[PDB]
Design a protein around this motif. Structure first.
Motif, PDB file in Angstrom:
ATOM      1  N   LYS A  17       0.801  -1.225   0.000  1.00 51.58           N
ATOM      2  CA  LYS A  17       0.000   0.000   0.000  1.00 51.58           C
ATOM      3  C   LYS A  17       0.847   1.294   0.000  1.00 51.58           C
ATOM      4  CE  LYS A  17      -0.656  -0.113   4.989  1.00 51.58           C
ATOM      5  NZ  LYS A  17      -1.594  -0.440   6.081  1.00 51.58           N
ATOM      6  N   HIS A  18       2.081   1.216   0.489  1.00 52.25           N
ATOM      7  CA  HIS A  18       2.991   2.378   0.548  1.00 52.25           C
ATOM      8  C   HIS A  18       3.689   2.631  -0.793  1.00 52.25           C
ATOM      9  CE1 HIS A  18       3.245   1.331   5.113  1.00 52.25           C
ATOM     10  NE2 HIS A  18       2.198   2.105   4.875  1.00 52.25           N
ATOM     11  N   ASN A  19       3.730   1.620  -1.663  1.00 47.79           N
ATOM     12  CA  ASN A  19       4.449   1.678  -2.937  1.00 47.79           C
ATOM     13  C   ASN A  19       3.615   1.006  -4.055  1.00 47.79           C
ATOM     14  OD1 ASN A  19       6.755   2.002  -4.745  1.00 47.79           O
ATOM     15  ND2 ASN A  19       7.372  -0.082  -4.243  1.00 47.79           N
ATOM     16  N   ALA A  20       2.449   1.578  -4.366  1.00 55.16           N
ATOM     17  CA  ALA A  20       1.489   0.977  -5.303  1.00 55.16           C
ATOM     18  C   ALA A  20       0.870   1.996  -6.244  1.00 55.16           C
ATOM     19  CB  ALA A  20       0.376   0.294  -4.538  1.00 55.16           C
ATOM     20  N   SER A  21       0.661   1.585  -7.481  1.00 54.19           N
ATOM     21  CA  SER A  21      -0.082   2.375  -8.461  1.00 54.19           C
ATOM     22  C   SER A  21      -1.325   1.576  -8.909  1.00 54.19           C
ATOM     23  CB  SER A  21       0.815   2.742  -9.650  1.00 54.19           C
ATOM     24  OG  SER A  21       1.757   1.709  -9.890  1.00 54.19           O
ATOM     25  N   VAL A  22      -2.419   1.764  -8.183  1.00 55.32           N
ATOM     26  CA  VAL A  22      -3.661   1.077  -8.486  1.00 55.32           C
ATOM     27  C   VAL A  22      -3.983   1.202  -9.981  1.00 55.32           C
ATOM     28  CG1 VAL A  22      -6.178   1.129  -8.129  1.00 55.32           C
ATOM     29  CG2 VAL A  22      -4.612   1.227  -6.153  1.00 55.32           C
ATOM     30  N   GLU A  23      -3.896   2.419 -10.490  1.00 52.45           N
ATOM     31  CA  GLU A  23      -4.387   2.755 -11.824  1.00 52.45           C
ATOM     32  C   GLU A  23      -3.498   2.112 -12.871  1.00 52.45           C
ATOM     33  OE1 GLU A  23      -5.606   5.623  -8.712  1.00 52.45           O
ATOM     34  OE2 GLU A  23      -3.636   5.239  -9.577  1.00 52.45           O
ATOM     35  N   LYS A  24      -2.200   2.189 -12.651  1.00 57.20           N
ATOM     36  CA  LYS A  24      -1.224   1.640 -13.591  1.00 57.20           C
ATOM     37  C   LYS A  24      -1.238   0.097 -13.589  1.00 57.20           C
ATOM     38  CE  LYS A  24       2.553   3.988 -13.281  1.00 57.20           C
ATOM     39  NZ  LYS A  24       3.868   4.671 -13.118  1.00 57.20           N
ATOM     40  N   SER A  25      -1.472  -0.474 -12.425  1.00 57.78           N
ATOM     41  CA  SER A  25      -1.736  -1.919 -12.321  1.00 57.78           C
ATOM     42  C   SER A  25      -2.980  -2.386 -13.112  1.00 57.78           C
ATOM     43  CB  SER A  25      -1.883  -2.331 -10.860  1.00 57.78           C
ATOM     44  OG  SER A  25      -0.672  -2.100 -10.215  1.00 57.78           O
ATOM     45  N   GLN A  26      -4.078  -1.620 -13.048  1.00 61.61           N
ATOM     46  CA  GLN A  26      -5.249  -1.992 -13.811  1.00 61.61           C
ATOM     47  C   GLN A  26      -4.934  -1.967 -15.266  1.00 61.61           C
ATOM     48  OE1 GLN A  26      -8.197  -3.482 -12.943  1.00 61.61           O
ATOM     49  NE2 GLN A  26      -7.108  -3.527 -10.968  1.00 61.61           N
ATOM     50  N   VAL A  27      -4.126  -0.986 -15.697  1.00 57.99           N
ATOM     51  CA  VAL A  27      -3.850  -0.853 -17.143  1.00 57.99           C
ATOM     52  C   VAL A  27      -2.964  -2.008 -17.568  1.00 57.99           C
ATOM     53  CG1 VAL A  27      -2.762   0.510 -19.001  1.00 57.99           C
ATOM     54  CG2 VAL A  27      -4.269   1.629 -17.381  1.00 57.99           C
ATOM     55  N   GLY A  28      -2.046  -2.392 -16.698  1.00 60.01           N
ATOM     56  CA  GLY A  28      -1.277  -3.609 -16.913  1.00 60.01           C
ATOM     57  C   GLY A  28      -2.101  -4.897 -16.943  1.00 60.01           C
ATOM     58  N   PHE A  29      -3.049  -5.015 -16.013  1.00 55.58           N
ATOM     59  CA  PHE A  29      -3.924  -6.164 -15.934  1.00 55.58           C
ATOM     60  C   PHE A  29      -4.695  -6.292 -17.229  1.00 55.58           C
ATOM     61  CE2 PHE A  29      -7.960  -7.890 -13.736  1.00 55.58           C
ATOM     62  CZ  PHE A  29      -7.475  -9.210 -13.746  1.00 55.58           C
ATOM     63  N   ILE A  30      -5.246  -5.185 -17.688  1.00 53.11           N
ATOM     64  CA  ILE A  30      -6.005  -5.186 -18.930  1.00 53.11           C
ATOM     65  C   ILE A  30      -5.103  -5.504 -20.109  1.00 53.11           C
ATOM     66  CG2 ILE A  30      -7.349  -3.786 -20.540  1.00 53.11           C
ATOM     67  CD1 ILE A  30      -8.458  -2.311 -18.090  1.00 53.11           C
ATOM     68  N   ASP A  31      -3.986  -4.796 -20.237  1.00 49.40           N
ATOM     69  CA  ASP A  31      -3.133  -4.977 -21.450  1.00 49.40           C
ATOM     70  C   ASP A  31      -2.516  -6.351 -21.596  1.00 49.40           C
ATOM     71  OD1 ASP A  31      -3.677  -2.328 -22.146  1.00 49.40           O
ATOM     72  OD2 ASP A  31      -1.736  -1.566 -21.458  1.00 49.40           O
ATOM     73  N   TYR A  32      -2.075  -6.945 -20.488  1.00 43.45           N
ATOM     74  CA  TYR A  32      -1.338  -8.219 -20.536  1.00 43.45           C
ATOM     75  C   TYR A  32      -2.180  -9.476 -20.221  1.00 43.45           C
ATOM     76  CZ  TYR A  32       2.662  -5.160 -21.256  1.00 43.45           C
ATOM     77  OH  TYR A  32       3.512  -4.191 -21.748  1.00 43.45           O
ATOM     78  N   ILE A  33      -3.337  -9.344 -19.544  1.00 37.69           N
ATOM     79  CA  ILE A  33      -4.145 -10.515 -19.144  1.00 37.69           C
ATOM     80  C   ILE A  33      -5.550 -10.475 -19.714  1.00 37.69           C
ATOM     81  CG2 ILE A  33      -5.165 -11.804 -17.227  1.00 37.69           C
ATOM     82  CD1 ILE A  33      -2.061 -11.965 -17.308  1.00 37.69           C
ATOM     83  N   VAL A  34      -6.314  -9.448 -19.337  1.00 35.98           N
ATOM     84  CA  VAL A  34      -7.744  -9.407 -19.622  1.00 35.98           C
ATOM     85  C   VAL A  34      -8.061  -9.163 -21.094  1.00 35.98           C
ATOM     86  CG1 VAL A  34      -9.937  -8.337 -18.913  1.00 35.98           C
ATOM     87  CG2 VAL A  34      -8.152  -8.812 -17.227  1.00 35.98           C
ATOM     88  N   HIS A  35      -7.417  -8.172 -21.699  1.00 39.08           N
ATOM     89  CA  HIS A  35      -7.686  -7.857 -23.111  1.00 39.08           C
ATOM     90  C   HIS A  35      -7.268  -8.986 -24.024  1.00 39.08           C
ATOM     91  CE1 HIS A  35      -7.580  -5.946 -27.095  1.00 39.08           C
ATOM     92  NE2 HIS A  35      -8.564  -5.179 -26.650  1.00 39.08           N
ATOM     93  N   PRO A  36      -6.105  -9.594 -23.798  1.00 34.54           N
ATOM     94  CA  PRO A  36      -5.741 -10.725 -24.711  1.00 34.54           C
ATOM     95  C   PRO A  36      -6.693 -11.917 -24.667  1.00 34.54           C
ATOM     96  CG  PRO A  36      -3.769  -9.939 -23.619  1.00 34.54           C
ATOM     97  CD  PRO A  36      -4.940  -9.100 -23.050  1.00 34.54           C
ATOM     98  N   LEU A  37      -7.177 -12.225 -23.467  1.00 32.19           N
ATOM     99  CA  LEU A  37      -8.192 -13.273 -23.296  1.00 32.19           C
ATOM    100  C   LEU A  37      -9.499 -12.927 -23.940  1.00 32.19           C
ATOM    101  CD1 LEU A  37      -9.155 -15.877 -22.052  1.00 32.19           C
ATOM    102  CD2 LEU A  37      -9.593 -14.613 -19.955  1.00 32.19           C
ATOM    103  N   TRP A  38     -10.009 -11.745 -23.600  1.00 29.80           N
ATOM    104  CA  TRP A  38     -11.318 -11.311 -24.147  1.00 29.80           C
ATOM    105  C   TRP A  38     -11.357 -11.072 -25.638  1.00 29.80           C
ATOM    106  CZ3 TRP A  38     -16.130 -11.754 -22.447  1.00 29.80           C
ATOM    107  CH2 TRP A  38     -16.324 -11.976 -21.102  1.00 29.80           C
ATOM    108  N   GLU A  39     -10.255 -10.602 -26.188  1.00 30.30           N
ATOM    109  CA  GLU A  39     -10.116 -10.430 -27.630  1.00 30.30           C
ATOM    110  C   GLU A  39     -10.158 -11.773 -28.294  1.00 30.30           C
ATOM    111  OE1 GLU A  39      -6.157  -9.066 -29.072  1.00 30.30           O
ATOM    112  OE2 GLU A  39      -7.257  -7.643 -30.366  1.00 30.30           O
ATOM    113  N   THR A  40      -9.503 -12.760 -27.688  1.00 28.62           N
ATOM    114  CA  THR A  40      -9.555 -14.113 -28.250  1.00 28.62           C
ATOM    115  C   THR A  40     -10.938 -14.716 -28.113  1.00 28.62           C
ATOM    116  OG1 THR A  40      -7.228 -14.326 -27.693  1.00 28.62           O
ATOM    117  CG2 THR A  40      -8.379 -16.314 -28.406  1.00 28.62           C
ATOM    118  N   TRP A  41     -11.572 -14.511 -26.963  1.00 32.62           N
ATOM    119  CA  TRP A  41     -12.960 -14.990 -26.778  1.00 32.62           C
ATOM    120  C   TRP A  41     -13.825 -14.341 -27.838  1.00 32.62           C
ATOM    121  CZ3 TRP A  41     -15.259 -18.901 -24.388  1.00 32.62           C
ATOM    122  CH2 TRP A  41     -16.669 -18.908 -24.344  1.00 32.62           C
TER     123      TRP A  41
END
Ligand SMILES: COc1ccc(C2=NN(C3CCCCCC3)C(=O)[C@@H]3CC=CC[C@H]23)cc1OCCCCOc1ccc(-c2nnn[nH]2)cc1
Ligand SMILES: [Mg+2]
Ligand SMILES: [Zn+2]
Length: 330
Positions: free
Chosen positions: A279-303
């Motif tokens: 919590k002292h060294n975190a970027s919530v927003e940048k993590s979400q963009v990473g989650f989307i770009d590397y995990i969620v979008h590739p899966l959903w685009e394939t689906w």
């Protein structure tokens, strides 16, 4: 005295959105007295006629569902009964996709829905690696391999043995064995360590995609059928960023609360703090963009390719939410 209480009417009206991506699942949780998994599952079982088809006595279904919902931890911010309810309902909506119309049997539909319901039951709010590094009893019990996921299955099935909880009491032995195998294969595939292989296999299936004369996906062997169900529930488990932003942001608050609590537990114990749990060294927003770009979008685009064009609005929402989170990175 015959008819619904007023709280029960408002709840019944929210439940009319059960076939829609973007159900106000948090409102359902409030209105049901923290029973979103029970009410949503019941509605879905009625809608799909599963009680009749499998001869499930309604009292047994409700007792099982309440018991199952009670073994989700109310003190865990993300991996609780609301998340279970949400994954069930998202799975339900994915099963209704036009490209899969009449593809899956009733027993497969049951498996996918039941798997979704049990898939995080009794989750303690910490990761597999945390459980392994602390020498927890569960890690010992499952030899460090898909610890949580093995546990979710075991509990989900064991609960069938509580008083009037055996919802599968009228299935034949062949049905039960088949259902059991499919549910195990689906829940084990929710372990993120399996994500890359599932996605590779989903891509392969899109590359070699075959359709029937009626336009529907052709799946002529167990291995392909189960791969699609596995990816379907896995999409539902990774569906938060594809939902209307008021929902997504609540899920994001919740997952981060859970991750930061794990990080606090790690820091207290002098363990190395896990990725994104500080919590002292975190970027919530940048993590979400990473989650989307590397995990969620590739899966959903394939689906989305697999079921083209049925998931276009889901993919559009995902891309919009991604731009939103990108625009909030200071
Ligand atoms: C609504 O927000 C979430 C909801 C759920 C999760 C989950 N997370 N995870 C894991 C573990 C975290 C690290 C990333 C992999 C996903 C679970 O195991 C959970 C259990 C099962 C299903 C997904 C759940 C994560 C959610 O986002 C919050 C954290 C997102 C960080 O993700 C990134 C992913 C890759 C990159 C990267 N950068 N370069 N290359 N790769 C950067 C960031
Ligand atoms: Mg899980
Ligand atoms: Zn989950």
């Amino acid at each position: 005295f015959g008819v619904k209480t007023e709280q029960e009417d408002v709840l019944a009206k929210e439940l009319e959105d059960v076939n829609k991506w973007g159900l106000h699942v948090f409102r359902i949780a409030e209105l049901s007295g923290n029973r979103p998994l029970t009410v949503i599952m019941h509605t879905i079982f009625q809608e799909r006629d599963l009680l009749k088809t499998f001869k499930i006595p309604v009292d047994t279904l409700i007792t099982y569902l309440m018991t199952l919902e009670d073994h989700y931890h109310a003190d865990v911010a993300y991996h609780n009964n609301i998340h279970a309810a949400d994954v069930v309902q998202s799975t339900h909506v994915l099963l209704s996709t036009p490209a899969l119309e009449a593809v899956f049997t009733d027993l497969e539909i049951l498996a996918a829905i039941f798997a979704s319901a049990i898939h995080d039951v009794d989750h303690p709010g910490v990761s597999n690696q945390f459980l392994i590094n602390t020498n927890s009893e569960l890690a010992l019990m499952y030899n460090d391999s898909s610890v949580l996921e093995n546990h979710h299955l075991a509990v989900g099935f064991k609960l069938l043995q509580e008083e009037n909880c055996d919802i599968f009491q009228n299935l034949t032995k062949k049905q039960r064995q088949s259902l059991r195998k499919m549910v195990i294969d689906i829940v084990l595939a929710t372990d993120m360590s399996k994500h890359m292989n599932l996605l590779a296999d989903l891509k392969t299936m899109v590359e070699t995609k075959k359709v029937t004369s009626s336009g529907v996906l052709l799946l002529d062997n167990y291995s392909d059928r189960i791969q699609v169900l596995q990816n379907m529930v896995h999409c539902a488990d990774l569906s938060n960023p594809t939902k209307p932003l008021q929902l997504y942001r609540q899920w994001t608050d919740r997952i981060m609360e859970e991750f930061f609590r794990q990080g606090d537990r790690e820091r207290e114990r002098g363990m190395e703090i896990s990725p994104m749990c500080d919590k002292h060294n975190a970027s919530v927003e940048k993590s979400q963009v990473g989650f989307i770009d590397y995990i969620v979008h590739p899966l959903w685009e394939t689906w989305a390719d697999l079921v083209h064009p049925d998931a276009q609005d889901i993919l559009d929402t995902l891309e919009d939410n991604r731009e939103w989170y990108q625009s909030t990175i200071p």
